[PDB]
Write a protein that binds this ligand. Sequence first.
Ligand code: BCL
Ligand code: BCL
Ligand code: BCL
Ligand SMILES: CC[C@H]1c2cc3[nH]c4c(c3C)C(=O)[C@H](C(=O)OC)c4c3nc(cc4[nH]c(cc(n2)[C@@H]1C)c(C(C)=O)c4C)[C@@H](C)[C@@H]3CCC(=O)OC/C=C(\C)CCC[C@@H](C)CCC[C@@H](C)CCCC(C)C
Ligand SMILES: CC[C@H]1c2cc3[nH]c4c(c3C)C(=O)[C@H](C(=O)OC)c4c3nc(cc4[nH]c(cc(n2)[C@@H]1C)c(C(C)=O)c4C)[C@@H](C)[C@@H]3CCC(=O)OC/C=C(\C)CCC[C@@H](C)CCC[C@@H](C)CCCC(C)C
Ligand SMILES: COC(C)(C)C(=O)C/C=C(\C)CC/C=C(\C)CC/C=C(\C)CCCC/C(C)=C/CC[C@@H](C)CC/C=C(\C)CCC=C(C)C
Ligand SMILES: CCCCCCCCCCCC[N+](C)(C)[O-]
Ligand SMILES: CCCCCCCCCCCC[N+](C)(C)[O-]
Ligand SMILES: CCCCCCCCCCCC[N+](C)(C)[O-]
Ligand SMILES: CCCCCCCCCCCC[N+](C)(C)[O-]
Ligand SMILES: CCCCCCCCCCCC[N+](C)(C)[O-]
Ligand SMILES: CCCCCCCCCCCC[N+](C)(C)[O-]
Ligand SMILES: [Fe+3]
Ligand code: NA
Ligand code: NA
Lengths: 281, 240, 302
Amino acid sequence: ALLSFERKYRVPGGTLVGGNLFDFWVGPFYVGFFGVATFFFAALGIILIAWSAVLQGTWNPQLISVYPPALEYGLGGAPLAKGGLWQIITICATGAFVSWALREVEICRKLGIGYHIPFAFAFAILAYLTLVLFRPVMMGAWGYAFPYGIWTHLDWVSNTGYTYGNFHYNPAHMIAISFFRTNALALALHGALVLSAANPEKGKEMRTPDHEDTFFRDLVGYSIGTLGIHRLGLLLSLSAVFFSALCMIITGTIWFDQWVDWWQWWVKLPWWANIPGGING
Amino acid sequence: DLASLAIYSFWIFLAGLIYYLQTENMREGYPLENEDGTPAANQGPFPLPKPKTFILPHGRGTLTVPGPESEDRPIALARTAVSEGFPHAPTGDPMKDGVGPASWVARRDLPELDGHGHNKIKPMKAAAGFHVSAGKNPIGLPVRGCDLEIAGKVVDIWVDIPEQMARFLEVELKDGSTRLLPMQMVKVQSNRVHVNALSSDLFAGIPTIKSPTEVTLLEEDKICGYVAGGLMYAAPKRKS
Amino acid sequence: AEYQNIFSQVQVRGPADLGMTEDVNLANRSGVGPFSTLLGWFGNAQLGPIYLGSLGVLSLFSGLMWFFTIGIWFWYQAGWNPAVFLRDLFFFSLEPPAPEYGLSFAAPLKEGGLWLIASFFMFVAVWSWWGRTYLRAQALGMGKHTAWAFLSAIWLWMVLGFIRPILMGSWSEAVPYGIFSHLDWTNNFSLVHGNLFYNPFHGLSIAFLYGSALLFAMHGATILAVSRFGGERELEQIADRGTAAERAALFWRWTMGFNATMEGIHRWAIWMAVLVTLTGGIGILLSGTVVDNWYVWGQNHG
Ligand code: BCL
Ligand code: BCL
Ligand code: BCL
Ligand SMILES: CC[C@H]1c2cc3[nH]c4c(c3C)C(=O)[C@H](C(=O)OC)c4c3nc(cc4[nH]c(cc(n2)[C@@H]1C)c(C(C)=O)c4C)[C@@H](C)[C@@H]3CCC(=O)OC/C=C(\C)CCC[C@@H](C)CCC[C@@H](C)CCCC(C)C
Ligand SMILES: CC[C@H]1c2cc3[nH]c4c(c3C)C(=O)[C@H](C(=O)OC)c4c3nc(cc4[nH]c(cc(n2)[C@@H]1C)c(C(C)=O)c4C)[C@@H](C)[C@@H]3CCC(=O)OC/C=C(\C)CCC[C@@H](C)CCC[C@@H](C)CCCC(C)C
Ligand SMILES: COC(C)(C)C(=O)C/C=C(\C)CC/C=C(\C)CC/C=C(\C)CCCC/C(C)=C/CC[C@@H](C)CC/C=C(\C)CCC=C(C)C
Ligand SMILES: CCCCCCCCCCCC[N+](C)(C)[O-]
Ligand SMILES: CCCCCCCCCCCC[N+](C)(C)[O-]
Ligand SMILES: CCCCCCCCCCCC[N+](C)(C)[O-]
Ligand SMILES: CCCCCCCCCCCC[N+](C)(C)[O-]
Ligand SMILES: CCCCCCCCCCCC[N+](C)(C)[O-]
Ligand SMILES: CCCCCCCCCCCC[N+](C)(C)[O-]
Ligand SMILES: [Fe+3]
Ligand code: NA
Ligand code: NA
């Protein structure tokens, strides 16, 4: 049940709600008020979903799907089998996620560390809330949200994007993608660097953080440093998701035409609009 | 059909990769223990990996992992309950005893070395050519604890040579001795450094170092330990 | 407000560090560059030195030939007019030879001969840069992780520009050099192969790409949360576990029931990332060579 060094850490304290009531573990898992909150919301949502599996007559992971109320129902309630289930499940999902985050904070308090982790998680949670909650509300209907099933939520990505042409042209989706890729490049480099220093050529002695700075310098003539690259990873990642959410919250709401056509603002500028030649003259 | 092969092949490669990866991550803290220190019955589905041996540089030796795991220190804690999985109450003063969020590991009692074999961390005074290049220079500022009292004054910055970054502030107490405070744990303001983790009276219990121009891995852990522990353990000494 | 360690509160500079020497040839390092207070709020303030070497100068020369080859064509397209060149920047494009010229080098200079020239220089530039990542690890006695990782990126790219074009019998399958036009090729490729969302490699690609974002965020945030105990000094935490590596492991063990080690996490990391382009290059390579339609294949094979 405990890691060799764990026991000195398992002290009382740090809870946000409940005093000592749920201050304990189950195997490896810390509980807490919010370990309980996330269980209730999580198990409810699973039930509510397996219920939805019955009312559409499949018991199959690749087919089970739960749709928002149709566009017609507005931003108001809906019969369970025709979009109500989804609404309560979403309420559950939010409950589970936010609870998971506040539980994470409680673990932070006990362990004496910074709140950086749940802070980062809340970006991902805010992306999700952008798809199922903030965009729908600004757009007038639950039906605009994505549906919970494995292949059917992809269908929604395709339909939502092709509504605007090739979605590539959303310029906040461009920034977004740039951060995802950049992040991946940074995750490979960090990983590979730390390992090439800890696991040197056969028989040599393990290298040092100065070797790590040296390797980079030699290669591209800069090194961000070991604090730097962990600041970087975290920034690239949070920025990917920030831009992800931004590209979607502006889509169908301030811009709803074909994304490629937004790029005409640049071309139709007074000082070069009408010069001949190139592609647009 | 080639693609169906490619993809079946790949789910196998990946299950193997996950095995490799999870075993590699058992070179520390395993085998699992009961709350009493003995081997636990349930070790999970993954076996300990074949040990490996890192050659430490500058003749500091080697490290082999996994290997015989032990705390190498009394742990001042006691059970609060009669079965598995409850919190363990501190037997004395948890700050002083080094438990909870005030824990330290018993790391080596040498300081870390740069690639040249010199100390990595050094007070600025002794660091050839190093000076504050930006931001408010703290050296000179009174230091305020979470109780809003002046604990001491800053008297130098301990810096990291190979990576040119501040690591501690060295601070001077009422009595004329000094302490390290981790950079990451103070706020430098226009007219003071502020320390949220510690009430002013807790400053004297900051673990001291032995040489006054170098600090050891073991001493960093105690200092960082102690100071982090203040978040939880000072907190009845501040309506902050 | 307590302090977060995203940006430094005080920078310190001392003498420029020239690096470690091991088996490097020092005749090839530049000398330091300037010092950037700006960078220094976030990372290190020191620019350079860099190592040139014969390979590095080869590489750097080609990558400029590749970039100038595409640029002169962009001026051509703009009719040498600086205002057009600007206005139309994302629209210009250097297209590969039409299907009819096959895998041959005959194609007129203006209808793709130029595309190959640019591609040739690109090849030269990437591979030699790859030799570089290896050699500079060797000079230092370090592992070859960076060169092997970079090979996985090189895979996807070789597949797009060279391998798949060669297996389909024509250079016209390859990707064009242009901002908007390469975006169009991408969409087009999907439509024409029955939609990549049906490619099971494509989906793994996503799991990983998304995976990288989740992971690096976990890690980055973990390291910053424990940097009040020296957490970023990962190599010394590997050699001699501190309360930083402990608090970190335990955050995750308590949250989600298992954890990593300070060395292990870097292995999770190097793999999460390289599998993005690994599975991707495979997904792409199968497309049009073995599978014409992912929807279709998706129907018999599941
Ligand atoms: C044909 C489709 C269109 C298109 C249309 C769209 C549409 C439509 C959307 C995107 C979105 C995205 N697209 Mg696009 N996209 C296209 C082409 C691309 C290409 C490419 C190479 O061509 C790329 C790289 C991308 C990349 C991207 C990203 C910017 C973004 C996806 C990441 C994200 O938002 O995460 C954010 C993360 C989350 C939402 C996950 C949150 C996780 C939660 C908090 C917790 C989960 C708990 C869970 C239940 C598990 C429980 C426990 C389990 C046991 C584990 N698109 C094409 C042209 N794209 C999406 C976006 O930006 O969304 C905001 C979006 O809606
Ligand atoms: C982000 C922008 C789009 C989107 C676009 C895509 C695209 C495009 C693709 C996926 C794919 C996936 N998406 Mg999706 N997806 C969206 C939002 C979500 C949300 C959510 C907000 O709650 C979830 C839980 C998922 C989950 C998933 C997985 C089923 C799959 C691989 C994910 C992955 O590796 O992520 C990174 C996370 C990790 C590596 C952590 C592990 C997470 C595990 C694997 C999640 C399992 C969830 C499980 C299937 C749902 C069970 C719920 C339980 C009842 C509680 N997507 C939005 C609408 N998603 C890929 C796929 O192949 O689908 C078939 C794919 O190509
Ligand atoms: C509408 C368009 C299609 C689509 C069509 C494609 C196509 C086509 C491809 C992808 C690919 C991918 N798609 Mg898709 N994709 C769609 C929708 C999505 C969505 C979504 C809807 O949310 C997502 C999240 C993704 C995600 C992804 C990526 C995971 C994957 C490529 C990874 C990568 O990083 O390559 C980027 C990395 C590289 C290209 C390698 C770069 C390395 C080289 C060596 C660097 C050279 C640098 C050069 C010298 C310049 C240097 C200058 C510097 C300034 C110094 N796609 C839809 C369905 N997608 C790729 C893939 O693998 O598919 C299986 C791919 O080919
Ligand atoms: C902001 C940067 C990235 C990020 C960060 C991030 N994610 C995080 C964290 C952080 C910092 C955590 O600390 C937390 C964690 O514990 O990590 C293991 C987490 C997490 N991110 C996860 C997943 C996840 N993150 C994603 C993305 C991202 N997370 C961003 C890329 C994605 C993507 C890309 O799609 C996924 C799938 C989980 C591993 C974990 C959160 C686990 C959690 O919150 O548990 C509580 C809830 C449950 C156990 C289940 C309850 C579910 C019910 C309410 C019903 C089901 C809901 C329904 C919406 C299902 C939809 C399925 C279909 C879409 C297929
Ligand atoms: C494994 C997956 C991820 C990955 C990994 C990866 N990439 C890598 C590596 C690794 C492990 C390296 O080691 C290597 C590297 O050296 O990193 C610093 C690299 C690299 N990945 C790079 C790019 C890159 N990686 C990408 C992606 C990815 N790489 C994946 C996400 C992408 C994408 C998403 O498209 C790009 C564009 C390079 C930084 C570098 C390989 C460098 C190379 O091959 O260089 C040859 C070229 C030259 C020497 C010169 C060309 C320069 C010209 C553009 C001149 C500039 C003109 C000037 C006047 C100013 C103008 C500036 C700009 C506005 C253009
Ligand atoms: C400001 O003006 C000046 C003149 C100074 C400029 O220089 C400006 C320059 C520009 C504006 C140019 C801008 C360049 C771009 C926008 C480039 C766009 C390119 C991409 C977005 C890349 C997309 C994908 C590229 C790929 C996948 C390439 C793969 C190529 C390789 C695999 C090479 C394969 C090799 C071949 C086909 C030839 C090899 C032949 C042999 C015989 C070996
Ligand atoms: C909620 C937990 C379940 C999530 C499982 C997601 C990963 C599934 C692995 C797919 C295996 C692939 N294949 C074809 C061999 O079956
Ligand atoms: C998607 C990548 C995440 C894969 C998760 C791997 C599960 C590992 C569980 C190991 C449990 C170890 N334990 C606690 C029994 O010792
Ligand atoms: C003794 C040799 C003199 C070399 C002159 C200094 C060159 C500056 C190096 C620039 C650094 C490269 N950078 C940052 C652009 O990538
Ligand atoms: C990798 C490049 C990142 C560039 C970083 C530039 C950020 C500067 C912000 C500094 C914080 C503000 N300040 C100094 C007033 O505290
Ligand atoms: C090396 C880290 C392992 C993390 C694994 C993530 C697995 C996600 C499974 C997604 C399923 C995609 N698809 C379409 C191929 O089935
Ligand atoms: C008692 C040990 C706890 C082990 C925790 C293992 C968590 C794995 C959760 C299963 C879901 C993983 N995945 C990728 C298939 O989604
Ligand atoms: Fe790291
Ligand atoms: Na000095
Ligand atoms: Na040379």
